[PDB]
């Protein structure tokens, strides 16, 4: 349970003369803050097992900006053996507080993989053309996580496999999809607004491909400021099935 951080150069190879120390228990998680400070660098903070935020580039303006942000940064942690989905957030200077909590029975379902949204992704078109000429708005969520859980018990017929769509901001499940005759390796990829996950059916020896897409209605919201505190609506979920004769490693 040792955690260490190194600061090296990807161009030459020689490391710099700046490295923070690590104490207490091993580092649990890290997050990259998009805001830049100091000279032209980004600020990095890490979470300890004592539930504390440690900032890598200690700088007065860095801490000033972090304090000015204050209730704007959230942190979700996922456990497999514990099966507990947690949400903490920064308050004022540096301290954790529990905001949203989720629990899942480990005996029934089991956590496998969790994918999210890439930080470096820009969407050009925010709508889609429809039958006559009407516009259709999409549902783009920068803060949305997808959980894939399977069944602990393995049987020829009895097989439980599903996908949960949870917001990291506020505990609220958008859509929960469930199958009944699928098992084995499952691969999930997340994109602009469409999720692609593949499975294998035991009842018929084949691989079925399910495509999930989230769509809004014909009218748009604020469309200037996106936040998960507001937007009390449920996006439409579309599912389709295909056949792929391969394994998809």
């Amino acid at each position: 349970g040792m955690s260490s951080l190194y600061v090296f150069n990807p161009i030459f190879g020689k490391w710099s003369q700046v490295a923070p120390p690590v104490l207490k228990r091993p580092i649990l998680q890290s997050l990259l803050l998009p805001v830049m400070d100091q000279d032209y660098a980004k600020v990095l903070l890490l979470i300890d097992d004592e539930y504390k935020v440690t900032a890598f580039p200690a700088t007065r303006n860095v801490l000033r900006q972090l304090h000015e942000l204050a209730p704007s940064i959230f942190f979700y942690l996922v456990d497999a053996e514990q099966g507990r989905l947690c949400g903490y957030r920064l308050r004022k200077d540096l301290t954790t507080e529990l905001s949203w909590e989720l629990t899942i029975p480990p005996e029934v379902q089991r956590i496998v993989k969790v994918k999210g949204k890439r930080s470096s992704e820009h969407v050009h078109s925010q709508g889609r053309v429809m039958g006559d000429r009407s516009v259709l708005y999409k549902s783009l969520n920068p803060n949305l996580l997808a959980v894939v859980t399977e069944s602990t018990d393995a049987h020829h017929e009895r097989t439980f496999i599903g996908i949960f769509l949870i917001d990291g901001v506020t505990g609220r499940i958008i859509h929960s999809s469930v199958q009944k005759k699928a098992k084995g390796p499952v691969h999930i990829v997340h994109s602009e607004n469409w999720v692609v996950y593949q499975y294998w059916n035991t009842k018929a020896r084949r691989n079925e491909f399910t495509v999930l897409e989230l769509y809004e209605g014909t009218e748009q919201y604020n469309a200037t400021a996106f936040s998960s505190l507001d937007r009390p609506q449920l996006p439409q979920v579309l599912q389709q099935s295909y056949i792929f004769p391969s394994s998809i490693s």
Binding site: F209, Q240, S241, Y242, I243, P245
Partner: protein, 50 residues
């Protein structure tokens, strides 16, 4: 629109790996280039291929 049909066939023409093959495909990393329509694909695993 093309009418819906659950039959996806693997065409040999849409094969990026013509001759060079990867014995074990652990993962693939795609990096965006700078022009507009160019993505650098690197497949890692038992061997390396770009």
């Amino acid at each position: 629109l093309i009418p819906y049909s659950p039959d996806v066939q693997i065409h040999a023409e849409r094969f990026i790996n013509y001759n060079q093959t990867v014995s074990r495909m652990r993962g693939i990393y795609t990096a965006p280039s700078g022009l507009e329509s160019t993505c650098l694909v690197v497949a890692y695993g038992l061997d390396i291929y770009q």
